[PDB]
Design an enzyme around this catalytic site. Structure first.
Site, PDB file in Angstrom:
ATOM      1  N   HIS A 123      30.331  43.747  20.381  1.00 21.09           N
ATOM      2  CA  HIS A 123      30.486  43.140  21.352  1.00 21.09           C
ATOM      3  C   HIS A 123      32.438  43.164  21.151  1.00 21.09           C
ATOM      4  O   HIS A 123      33.283  42.240  21.842  1.00 21.09           O
ATOM      5  CB  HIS A 123      30.558  41.752  20.620  1.00 21.09           C
ATOM      6  N   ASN A 240      16.870  34.125   9.858  1.00 19.98           N
ATOM      7  CA  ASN A 240      17.261  33.035  10.687  1.00 19.98           C
ATOM      8  C   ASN A 240      16.702  31.852  10.420  1.00 19.98           C
ATOM      9  O   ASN A 240      16.200  31.935   9.372  1.00 19.98           O
ATOM     10  CB  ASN A 240      16.800  33.023  11.925  1.00 19.98           C
TER      11      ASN A 240
END
Ligand SMILES: [Zn+2]
Length: 267
Positions: A123, A240
């Protein structure tokens, strides 16, 4: 999915090509926001004001104010135990002819601060510029990035008076250009760099173990990287704090803060 860390570490013992995919959750503990967590950037602001091409064409100063703010905050931030466990893992495995590659969504560069080398920044980077006229891409670590931004804090789109004229925003310092610069990042509705994407694709075809650390697995195409690999029969392990759209595709899920869950996995 299993949370059997023993069983996972057996897969780890035998892997030659490990792909580690990362999102903002891996950086959180360094003391910076995520995007969609509590106090996240897309909670505080509306993403369509700050991270689309239209946002930038309509209000380049508001957008720059937000990236300036983030740049100035990030300068002094440090890699956390998760970044560091990833770097040490790459250096240790690399020394034994085994490959570890990091495929990151984060633009914060903290994986480079930790010493990781095989890093795809899918990104872009918080610290790179791209020129709107000539297309030149450059690292830019000036603080502030331009004089008009000196001492600006986090922007409020309602404070019209805080906006800077476009001519005083970062300009291309290439001799004979002066084009407007934008952050060299990937916004919603913009293709990822095709060279990067292709190389990532081949890494994912070659990997024999995949980890997915601190990402919400909402944003595409990154959210399907680990699902793709799992559809080849490769073990994927999710790290996570919660379950995501993708968890039920993966062989392992290790719940918790990655600062503590990731380092014993990579030991
Ligand atoms: Zn230029």
């Amino acid at each position: 999915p299993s949370s059997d860390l023993t069983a996972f570490r057996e897969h780890f013992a035998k892997a030659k090509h490990i792909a580690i995919i990362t999102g903002a959750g891996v950086s959180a503990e360094s003391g910076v926001p995520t995007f969609r967590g509590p106090g996240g950037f897309w909670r505080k602001w509306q993403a369509q004001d700050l991270a689309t091409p239209e946002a930038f064409s309509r209000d380049p100063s508001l957008v720059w104010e937000f990236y300036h703010y983030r740049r100035e905050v990030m300068r002094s931030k440090m890699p956390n135990p998760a970044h560091l466990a990833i770097a040490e893992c790459e250096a240790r495995l690399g020394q034994q002819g085994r490959s570890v590659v990091i495929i990151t969504q984060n633009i914060d560069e903290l994986h480079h601060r930790a010493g990781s080398k095989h890093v795809y920044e899918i990104h872009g980077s918080l610290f790179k510029t791209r020129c709107m006229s000539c297309g030149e891409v450059k690292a830019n670590h000036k603080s502030p990035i331009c004089p008009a931004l000196d001492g600006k804090g986090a922007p409020d789109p309602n404070t019209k008076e805080a906006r800077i004229p476009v001519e005083l925003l970062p300009r291309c310092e290439r001799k004979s250009c002066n084009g407007l610069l934008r952050p060299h990042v990937v916004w919603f509705g913009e293709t990822l760099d095709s060279d990067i994407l292709t190389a990532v694709e081949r890494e994912l075809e070659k990997c024999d173990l995949c980890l997915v650390v601190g990402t919400s697995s909402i944003v595409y195409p990154a959210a399907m990287f680990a699902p793709q690999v799992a559809s080849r029969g490769v073990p994927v392990a999710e790290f996570n704090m919660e379950c995501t759209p993708a968890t039920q595709r993966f062989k392992y899920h290790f719940e918790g803060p990655c600062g503590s869950t990731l380092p014993p996995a990579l030991e």
